[PDB]
């Protein structure tokens, strides 16, 4: 299988630096030009830099020239971006991206979010969302988890350890006035199930090494 696996991103103080890595497999990496592309939250794709097969030529967008360096290690099938003098303007998901002439749809990495901020990592509080019995009126019941007060993005939410996917809606996070994120994840389920099936949300906030599993207990009169 083709894979481009990124690491090295995350939270970083303004003025600081990060080293992004991208480990490629499943096609002849050393035969292609490679690039980095970034996407600020809510914005479009922006090409950042590229590099020739053998590393001997490379180009940069003006706003990063002199402070970002693209490099590659063909022996390790890996691409790198060394990023210095970071600013809020650099906050973005960063993708490694193969020359399109590779002709493979899955030719970019999974992305790594770089958040340029002086704030600390903070793990979420996870609270149950259970509607009152009196307010549950017909056949399909909603429940959820509120994932509150974390930083930076992202969090992942699953239900019943990935067993429950139908009817799940994990909302985009919202930034609160506090500067911390909040998200809800809900699932709709048959009312008939509420008695005989447990519903647990599994929340992972990798930036703070926080994992929480919360059992959501239904309400009855």
């Amino acid at each position: 299988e083709v894979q481009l696996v990124e690491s090295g991103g995350g939270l970083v103080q303004p003025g600081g630096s990060l080293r992004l890595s991208c480990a490629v497999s499943g096609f002849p990496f050393s035969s292609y030009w490679m690039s980095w592309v970034r996407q600020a939250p809510g914005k479009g794709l922006e090409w950042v830099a590229n590099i020739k097969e053998d590393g001997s030529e490379k180009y940069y967008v003006d706003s990063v020239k002199g402070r970002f360096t693209i490099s590659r290690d063909n022996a390790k099938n890996s691409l790198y971006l060394q990023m210095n003098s970071l600013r809020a303007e650099d906050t973005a998901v960063y993708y490694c991206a193969t020359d399109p002439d590779v002709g493979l749809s899955d030719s970019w990495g999974q992305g790594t979010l770089v958040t340029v901020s002086s704030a600390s990592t903070k793990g979420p509080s996870v609270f149950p969302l259970a509607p009152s019995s009196k307010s549950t009126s017909g056949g399909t019941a909603a429940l959820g988890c509120l994932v509150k007060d974390y930083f930076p993005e992202p969090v992942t939410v699953s239900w019943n350890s990935g067993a429950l996917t139908s009817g799940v809606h994990t909302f985009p996070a919202v930034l609160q006035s506090s500067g911390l994120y909040s998200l809800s994840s809900v699932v709709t389920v048959p009312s008939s199930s509420l008695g005989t099936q447990t519903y647990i949300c599994n929340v992972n906030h990798k930036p703070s090494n926080t994992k929480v599993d919360k059992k959501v207990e239904p309400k009855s009169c």
């Binding site: 509080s125 399909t140 809606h169």
Partner: protein, 215 residues
Amino acid sequence: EIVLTQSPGTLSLSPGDRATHSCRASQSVSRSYLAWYQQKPGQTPRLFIYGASNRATGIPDRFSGSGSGTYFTLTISRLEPEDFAVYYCQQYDSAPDTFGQGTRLEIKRTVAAPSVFIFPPSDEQLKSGTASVVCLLNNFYPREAKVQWKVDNALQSGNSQESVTEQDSKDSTYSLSSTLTLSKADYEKHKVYACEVTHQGLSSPVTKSFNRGEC
């Protein structure tokens, strides 16, 4: 730099329809160096077309690309509900290997009213001094919806936030969460918590409410 300008900014079409995405370049680009990508929300872009007109691996036959010079298109010949995305063009002739600004393709469907649910704050949360009340609008279309919070029949302003899911890949509906944030003190001072929903699929606005403490 070569500037790429995409049109339209937003395109909303039904399954079966032919979708056309345009990409104009400020100077001529060789066919060999124009790509198109599909990006789903929160996901890595996928390469769909390379060299102006070649399909990447795994790309269905309903996607095609064409053009030369300063005008290029991506076509979806027969739209499917899973095709919602932002589509970007990119030139890779000369650095910077610029992207266009994207065309957002949304899938049209027939009108669908939301189902509305309301969740009180948990006792766990109240221990911390804040109360979050959540209103869910589930599986509706179109996206536009008005949500109003009332507390003991008083309209709230400035203390709620909303977010919306991506379109469902099969049935093209949205869901929306609205969260009202109050102090614990404020929550415990009042009884009736209501979210009122206005949406074109409804015959009349719907209010979902609870009384604090009810089973």
